[PDB]
Each structure stands twice: as structure tokens, then as C-alpha cells.
Design an enzyme around this catalytic site. Structure first.
Site, mmCIF file in Angstrom:
data_model
loop_
_atom_site.group_PDB
_atom_site.id
_atom_site.type_symbol
_atom_site.label_atom_id
_atom_site.label_comp_id
_atom_site.label_asym_id
_atom_site.label_seq_id
_atom_site.Cartn_x
_atom_site.Cartn_y
_atom_site.Cartn_z
ATOM 1 N N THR A 267 0.839 -1.200 0.057
ATOM 2 C CA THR A 267 0.065 0.056 -0.044
ATOM 3 C C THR A 267 1.033 1.301 -0.042
ATOM 4 O O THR A 267 0.976 2.019 -1.072
ATOM 5 C CB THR A 267 -0.993 -0.069 1.171
ATOM 6 O OG1 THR A 267 -0.315 -0.016 2.356
ATOM 7 C CG2 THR A 267 -2.005 -1.252 0.965
ATOM 8 N N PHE A 392 -9.051 4.764 2.614
ATOM 9 C CA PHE A 392 -8.665 4.053 3.891
ATOM 10 C C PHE A 392 -10.184 3.341 4.189
ATOM 11 O O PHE A 392 -10.202 2.647 5.407
ATOM 12 C CB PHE A 392 -8.164 5.047 5.068
ATOM 13 C CG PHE A 392 -7.090 5.526 4.694
ATOM 14 C CD1 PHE A 392 -5.719 4.631 4.710
ATOM 15 C CD2 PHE A 392 -6.672 6.699 4.207
ATOM 16 C CE1 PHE A 392 -4.372 5.082 4.241
ATOM 17 C CE2 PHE A 392 -5.174 7.309 4.042
ATOM 18 C CZ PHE A 392 -4.313 6.403 3.973
ATOM 19 N N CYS A 399 -9.121 1.551 7.642
ATOM 20 C CA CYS A 399 -7.535 1.101 7.988
ATOM 21 C C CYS A 399 -7.182 1.468 9.072
ATOM 22 O O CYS A 399 -7.380 2.747 9.635
ATOM 23 C CB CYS A 399 -6.900 1.831 6.848
ATOM 24 S SG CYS A 399 -5.155 1.357 6.649
HETATM 25 C C1 HEM Z 1 -1.472 4.297 1.919
HETATM 26 C C2 HEM Z 1 -1.461 3.301 2.663
HETATM 27 C C3 HEM Z 1 -2.742 2.299 2.923
HETATM 28 C C4 HEM Z 1 -3.927 2.277 2.118
HETATM 29 C C5 HEM Z 1 -4.319 3.016 1.139
HETATM 30 C C6 HEM Z 1 -4.821 1.470 2.980
HETATM 31 C C7 HEM Z 1 -6.019 1.074 2.590
HETATM 32 C C8 HEM Z 1 -6.906 0.287 3.512
HETATM 33 C C9 HEM Z 1 -8.494 0.380 3.243
HETATM 34 C C10 HEM Z 1 -9.017 0.549 1.992
HETATM 35 C C11 HEM Z 1 -8.843 -0.722 4.084
HETATM 36 C C12 HEM Z 1 -10.190 -1.179 4.219
HETATM 37 C C13 HEM Z 1 -10.587 -2.412 3.463
HETATM 38 C C14 HEM Z 1 -11.784 -3.079 3.570
HETATM 39 O O1 HEM Z 1 -13.117 -2.395 3.833
HETATM 40 O O2 HEM Z 1 -11.841 -4.327 3.030
HETATM 41 C C15 HEM Z 1 -7.869 -0.876 4.963
HETATM 42 C C16 HEM Z 1 -7.710 -1.700 6.053
HETATM 43 C C17 HEM Z 1 -6.846 -2.108 6.913
HETATM 44 N N1 HEM Z 1 -5.416 -1.622 6.779
HETATM 45 FE FE1 HEM Z 1 -4.749 -0.399 5.378
HETATM 46 N N2 HEM Z 1 -4.098 0.897 3.956
HETATM 47 C C18 HEM Z 1 -2.939 1.621 4.008
HETATM 48 C C19 HEM Z 1 -1.794 1.141 4.874
HETATM 49 C C20 HEM Z 1 -1.833 0.196 5.867
HETATM 50 C C21 HEM Z 1 -0.739 -0.155 6.772
HETATM 51 C C22 HEM Z 1 0.781 0.659 6.719
HETATM 52 C C23 HEM Z 1 -1.423 -0.973 7.640
HETATM 53 C C24 HEM Z 1 -0.456 -1.665 8.690
HETATM 54 C C25 HEM Z 1 0.821 -1.789 9.144
HETATM 55 C C26 HEM Z 1 -2.555 -1.262 7.210
HETATM 56 C C27 HEM Z 1 -3.339 -2.380 7.965
HETATM 57 C C28 HEM Z 1 -4.909 -2.255 7.796
HETATM 58 C C29 HEM Z 1 -5.499 -3.257 8.646
HETATM 59 C C30 HEM Z 1 -5.145 -4.253 9.540
HETATM 60 C C31 HEM Z 1 -6.718 -3.154 7.939
HETATM 61 C C32 HEM Z 1 -7.849 -3.946 8.580
HETATM 62 C C33 HEM Z 1 -8.626 -3.054 9.688
HETATM 63 C C34 HEM Z 1 -9.827 -3.434 10.108
HETATM 64 O O3 HEM Z 1 -10.773 -3.956 9.464
HETATM 65 O O4 HEM Z 1 -9.825 -3.619 11.555
HETATM 66 N N3 HEM Z 1 -3.008 -0.406 6.317
HETATM 67 N N4 HEM Z 1 -6.519 -0.403 4.610
#
Ligand code: HEM
Ligand code: G56
Length: 454
Positions: A267, A392, A399
Site C-alpha cells: 500500500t 482508507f 484502515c
Molecule cells: C496508503 C496506505 C494504505 C492504504 C491506502 C490502506 C487502505 C486500506 C483500506 C481501503 C482498508 C479497508 C479494507 C476493506 O474494507 O476491506 C484497509 C484496512 C486495513 N489496513 Fe490499510 N491501508 C494502508 C496502509 C496500511 C498499513 C501501513 C497497515 C498496517 C501496518 C494497514 C493495515 C490495515 C488493516 C489491519 C486493515 C483492517 C482494519 C480492520 O478492519 O480492523 N494498512 N486499509
């Protein structure tokens, strides 16, 4: 009450063969451009509806009506990310338990503790580029992926992937990239049971075992040492859920680590790559961001407080996320029977896909200049309509890494703009490769050092 359009069909395979491409998200974006704000998409045994308008997505983001669904992509990633936060249902015990335990680890306050580890890797990137010879160029997504993988290894479990010391990937990353490739390729398969996929299935099982064995050993080695390093693994070994009073078990901790390595690899590296693309294609914007970097970053090493003052750099990152949200979709299910947009009746359990790059091109929100790179759009969040900007995700299932990703990306982009001038020496034509995420492919630049010491 309206009948929604549907793209072209292939007899009993319905719309499935539209995904038989290396760029399925970009294909779905072209379908949305042709058909508008909502279309039906069918595969054998499955129906979803692709949403592209803020008008409909603002309703889809109502947590009283819709909860997070696991898309087929996330169901296949769950074969190795398990009941980690990203691949758990909201109703699974381990979702709320891990969410409660990990939220303090991902707050703005926690970033003060991760900052020195982020600077360690950002300085390695700047020194690499300072050491290039005049005849050389930078492989942008390659170097950004080296950085973001190394950052999450160091903040996640005090492990150095040492990505700037090698071309050959770490054994864990060979298996993780190949497992992600199998998960995403399996989406398109009309005949997954075909014996021609036996080797793919054997290799996928081998890659799951490699990831499990290596991460289980990291956890076991940490428990044995007793070392109390300020990383996510220590927080997960020591943390108790305030609700249940329980800690995470070692299996769930392994799934969280695998999830964080996927996120760090896939990401933030995409975001940084798209941001540098837009800056070299918009030199007036690059100049404005470079002026902020020079004015704010007055010390050899940036501090946490200085990164918080890179406001224009933060607007550049939001505008890159607007045009190319590197995690390009999320999925929802109807909690009960409901009507979407006064026009589209849904039954309990019905699925929706949010096509984030199309949401971000809604001209009723952004105006006629929607394809232009203009960070000033983000000056005033109160002037942006509700649910117009979703890179996010949404609500409690948004996220958890958002603060972490934007801190790392702001720090690194600020240091890049402080230390170098950039040249688009090839007049690069944007080519977007799709893995789990979107990244520029083949994007190269030349850096000319400003010769400012670290
Ligand atoms: C620009 C960077 C990032 C973008 C654009 C991004 C985008 C997203 C998006 C769109 C979701 C929602 C997914 C869904 O509804 O199915 C998500 C969930 C998540 N992201 Fe990211 N993410 C980024 C960076 C990170 C980083 C650096 C981490 C961890 C080190 C991370 C960990 C997670 C986790 C664990 C979830 C699930 C949260 C939950 O439902 O409890 N993300 N991310
Ligand atoms: O529309 C998409 C886009 O693919 C992605 C889904 C999530 C995703 O995760 C993340 F956004 F987080 F990166 C990345 C790509 N996927 C759909 C494609 C599909 C397959 C079979 C029948 C109908 C539809 C899906 O995975 O269900």
C-alpha cells in the site's frame, strides 16, 4: 425503482471473463465510465453491484445498514492472513478483540515512538540516491517497496529485511508475493477444479507453510528472549483487550504480522510512487511542495513535530490517493432489506463493491477539473462532501494503519523533496500494475542532489 445496467456476458460464465486480464480494476473502471454509478456483475454462483457515485456510496457507508463483506480477493487472502484484522468478519470474536488491543499501537501518539525507526529507513533511501552515478536512474516503485517493507519489519517486530542491500527477495517475501499472486489470479478462474491448477495449489500450500513457519519462529524467539522492544509484536504479547480481559493468542498474532507485512509491501509504496509520478508531471506543484520541505525540515534528521508541519506534502498525498487509491475497492453486505438511492431495492445479505478510483472521479463532487492534480482541493475538509473520499475504507472497518502510512509517506516525501530535484527523463507513460494493490510499473526518474548533508 430502476433496473441497473450490466456489462457484456459470456453465456453460463456471465461476466466472469471480464476479469480475465492483468488489470481487472482498470477494466471495472472503464465499465463504470460506460454504464454509470451502479452496475450488476455476475459470476457462476455470485452477484455483486459496483458503486461509483458519491450519491450511492454515502448510503453504502451507513454502518446501520451495511457491514464489511469479504470480497473473493479477501476470502482467498484469508487462506494466509487468517482472522487478522483485514480478513476477519466484524462479528468474529478476534476482530473486536484485536481492534481494541491494537488501536493504541496505531494512534498518532504511537507514531512518536515509531518515528526514529521510520527515519532509519528513510535515511537509507536518501543515501542510496545520493550514491547513484550521473548515468543512472531510480526505479521508483522498486525503491519505495524496499522502504515500506523495511519500515514495517522494524516497527512490526524489530527485524531488518535490509531491502537496500539486495535484489533477491527475502524467502518470506518470495512466498508472500507468490501467495498474493495466486489469490488474485484465482479470482478470474472459470474452471478452478481443472487439473492444470494442481501445481498452483501445491505451491500455494508450500508458500502458506513458509509464511507460518517463519512468523511462528519470530514470535517464539521473542517470547524466549524476553526483550521488550517498542514494536507491534511487544504490544501484542503484552496487551489485554479491555472488554474480554484476554490477550491475543500466538496464532492470531502470526495472522496480524502477516497482515502488516502485506500492507507495508503493497500500500504505502504505491502511494509514494503515485505521489512522485504526479509531482514530476506537475512541476508547479513539485516546486510548492519542495518549498515547504526546505522551510520546515531545518535539521539533518526530521523530527515527529516537523513531519506534522508538512501540511502541503500531506495535501499532495491525499490528491495522489484521490486519483489512484492504491487499495482500490472494498465490499459491503446489506444487514437488512433496504433501498439504495430511492431506486435499487436490496435484500438482507446482498453484496456491494465500492470502486474507489471512480468515486474519486465523481464530477458532481470535484468539478470539471477532476482529472487534474490539484492538492489545494484538500485545504478545507469541511468543504468536501460526506463520503466523497474513501482511500482508507469506512467506519469501524477503516484502515487501522492510516496514521502509520501517512506519517511514513509524509516523512519520506518531505526528505525526498528536501534533498533532490527530479527529472522525468523518459517522459514516462503511466502503466499501472495490479497485485493486491495498484502501483506504477516501469516508473523511472533521475534525481539531482541539492548536496544537503544528513
Ligand atoms: C496508503 C496506505 C494504505 C492504504 C491506502 C490502506 C487502505 C486500506 C483500506 C481501503 C482498508 C479497508 C479494507 C476493506 O474494507 O476491506 C484497509 C484496512 C486495513 N489496513 Fe490499510 N491501508 C494502508 C496502509 C496500511 C498499513 C501501513 C497497515 C498496517 C501496518 C494497514 C493495515 C490495515 C488493516 C489491519 C486493515 C483492517 C482494519 C480492520 O478492519 O480492523 N494498512 N486499509
Ligand atoms: O472488484 C474487485 C477488485 O479487487 C480487489 C478487491 C479488494 C482489494 O483489496 C484492497 F483494496 F484492499 F486492496 C483489492 C482488489 N474484486 C472482486 C472481483 C470479483 C470476482 C468474482 C466475482 C465478482 C467479482 C472480488 O474480489 O470479489
Amino acid at each position: 425503482i430502476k433496473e441497473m445496467p450490466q456489462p457484456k456476458t459470456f453465456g453460463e460464465l456471465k461476466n466472469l471473463p471480464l476479469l480475465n486480464t492483468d488489470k481487472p480494476v482498470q477494466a471495472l473502471m472503464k465499465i463504470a465510465d460506460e454504464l454509470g454509478e451502479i452496475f450488476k456483475f455476475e459470476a457462476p454462483g455470485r452477484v455483486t453491484r459496483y458503486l461509483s457515485s458519491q450519491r450511492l456510496i454515502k448510503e453504502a457507508c451507513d454502518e446501520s445498514r451495511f457491514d464489511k463483506n469479504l470480497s473473493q480477493a479477501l476470502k482467498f487472502v484469508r487462506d494466509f492472513a487468517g482472522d487478522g484484522l483485514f480478513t476477519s468478519w466484524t462479528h468474529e470474536k478476534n476482530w473486536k478483540k484485536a481492534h481494541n488491543i491494537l488501536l493504541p499501537s496505531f494512534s498518532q501518539q504511537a507514531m512518536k515512538g515509531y518515528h526514529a525507526m521510520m527515519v532509519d529507513i528513510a535515511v537509507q533511501l536518501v543515501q542510496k540516491w545520493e550514491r547513484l552515478n550521473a548515468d543512472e536512474h531510480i526505479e521508483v516503485p522498486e525503491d519505495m517497496t524496499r522502504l515500506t517493507l523495511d519500515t514495517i519489519g522494524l516497527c512490526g517486530f524489530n527485524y531488518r529485511f535490509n531491502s537496500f542491500y539486495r535484489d533477491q527477495p527475502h524467502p518470506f517475501i518470495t512466498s508472500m508475493v507468490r501467495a498474493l499472486d495466486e489469490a488474485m489470479n484465482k479470482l478470474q478462474r472459470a474452471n478452478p477444479d481443472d487439473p492444470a491448477y494442481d501445481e498452483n495449489k501445491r505451491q500455494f500450500q508450500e508458500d502458506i507453510k513458509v509464511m507460518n513457519d517463519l512468523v511462528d519462529k519470530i514470535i517464539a524467539d521473542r517470547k524466549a528472549s524476553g526483550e521488550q522492544s517498542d514494536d507491534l509484536l511487544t504490544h501484542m504479547l503484552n496487551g489485554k483487550d479491555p472488554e474480554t480481559g484476554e490477550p491475543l493468542d500466538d496464532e492470531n498474532i502470526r495472522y496480524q504480522i502477516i497482515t502488516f507485512l502485506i500492507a507495508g509491501h503493497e500500500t504505502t509504496s504505491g502511494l509514494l510512487s503515485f505521489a512522485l509520478y504526479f509531482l514530476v508531471k506537475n512541476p508547479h506543484v513539485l516546486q510548492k511542495a519542495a518549498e515547504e520541505a526546505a522551510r520546515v525540515l531545518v535539521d539533518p534528521v526530521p523530527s515527529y513535530k516537523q513531519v506534522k508541519q508538512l501540511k502541503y506534502v500531506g495535501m499532495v498525498l491525499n490528491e495522489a490517493l484521490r486519483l489512484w487509491p492504491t487499495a482500490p475497492a472494498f465490499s459491503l453486505y446489506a444487514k437488512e432489506d433496504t433501498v439504495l438511492g430511492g431506486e435499487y431495492p436490496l435484500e438482507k445479505g446482498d453484496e456491494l463493491m465500492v470502486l474507489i478510483p471512480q468515486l474519486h472521479r465523481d464530477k458532481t463532487i470535484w468539478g470539471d477539473d477532476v482529472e487534474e492534480f490539484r492538492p489545494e482541493r484538500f485545504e478545507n475538509p469541511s468543504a468536501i462532501p460526506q463520503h466523497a473520499f474513501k482511500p482508507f475504507g469506512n467506519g469501524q472497518r477503516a484502515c487501522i494503519g492510516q496514521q502509520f502510512a501517512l506519517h511514513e509517506a509524509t516523512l519520506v516525501l518531505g526528505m525526498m523533496l528536501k534533498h533532490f530535484d527530479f527529472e522525468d527523463h523518459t517522459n514516462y507513460e503511466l502503466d499501472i500494475k495490479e497485485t493486491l494493490t495498484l502501483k506504477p510499473e516501469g516508473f523511472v526518474v533521475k534525481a539531482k542532489s541539492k548536496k544537503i548533508p544528513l
